[PDB]
Symmetry: C3
Subunit: 91 residues, 3 copies
Amino acid sequence: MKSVQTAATSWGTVPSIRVYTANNGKITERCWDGKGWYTGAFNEPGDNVSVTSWLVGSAIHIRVYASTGTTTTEWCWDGNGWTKGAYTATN
Amino acid sequence: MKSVQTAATSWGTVPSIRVYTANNGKITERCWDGKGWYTGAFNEPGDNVSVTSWLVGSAIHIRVYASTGTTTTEWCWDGNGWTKGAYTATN
Amino acid sequence: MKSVQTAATSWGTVPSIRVYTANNGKITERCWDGKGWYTGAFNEPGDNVSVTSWLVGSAIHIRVYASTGTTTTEWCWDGNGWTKGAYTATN
Ligand SMILES: OC[C@@]1(O)OC[C@@H](O)[C@@H](O)[C@@H]1O
Ligand SMILES: OC[C@@]1(O)OC[C@@H](O)[C@@H](O)[C@@H]1O
Ligand SMILES: OC[C@@]1(O)OC[C@@H](O)[C@@H](O)[C@@H]1O
Ligand SMILES: OC[C@@]1(O)OC[C@@H](O)[C@@H](O)[C@@H]1O
Ligand SMILES: OC[C@@]1(O)OC[C@@H](O)[C@@H](O)[C@@H]1O
Ligand SMILES: OC[C@@]1(O)OC[C@@H](O)[C@@H](O)[C@@H]1O
């Protein structure tokens, strides 16, 4: 019995938390902004996940690294929707 | 599981570091505060681990996400003990 | 199928990002500082990887925890080359 795999990030002092879970090839996102957990907009394929985030002033930026096989895809949140990032592995 | 699985967080400029290792279904904690590595109070079940933390002043707040199977348990350090948090993977 | 396993850290407001990938027993590093992804100096054996980093002023310090079997090795970046750290899982 394998286990799901998670990645977590947080920012500010409320704080906001985002937890990403890779489960059966699908990565989903749960969100905390101080008043209960809810399901976020991130939904992308992957068996492995890592995450980092940074603030510019008050604006959060999130990068999620989703891996299937040997291919890692980066996904970007910059305040107005998830988009694919430029990340590639060694060529 | 071939190898153990780790997660790490750090805070301040000394820094303090906490490293969580999932090994044989148990997660344990090693701590650095600038003066040598020692074993921390965290000990909970899990095959997978992730962590995030934030400061309020000089006071650290840690959240560890411990997963076994498809069950992810959030553990909260807010200065005095590890308490089960409100996190669920789905409302 | 099995997939590679990653860990990510970031700092500053550009930001700089480092992504560590464990692939078939080797951990390598990809780097972003605003101007394209490139291959970093980090290269160490391991089947699992986690990372944390902290700034002291504008100087970044990175700790990478590489695991093979039950043995976790800490690798330290402090501005001038990767060195093995004092981390042990026991004692
Ligand atoms: O406010 C919720 C939300 O917009 O926060 C930023 C990202 O985590 C999004 O996926 C998420 O749906
Ligand atoms: O704004 C998108 C982006 O430029 O952000 C920094 C890195 O995450 C890049 O790979 C990514 O394409
Ligand atoms: O000083 C050690 C300690 O109290 O630091 C905060 C948490 O990491 C605890 O598990 C840990 O025992
Ligand atoms: O104080 C505990 C708590 O409220 O902290 C913020 C989140 O980690 C919650 O899931 C958790 O229950
Ligand atoms: O500029 C790239 C670099 O020096 O940045 C700090 C560390 O990530 C190093 O491994 C890496 O080669
Ligand atoms: O400067 C290296 C070092 O002292 O930094 C703090 C911890 O990462 C230690 O394990 C490590 O040896």
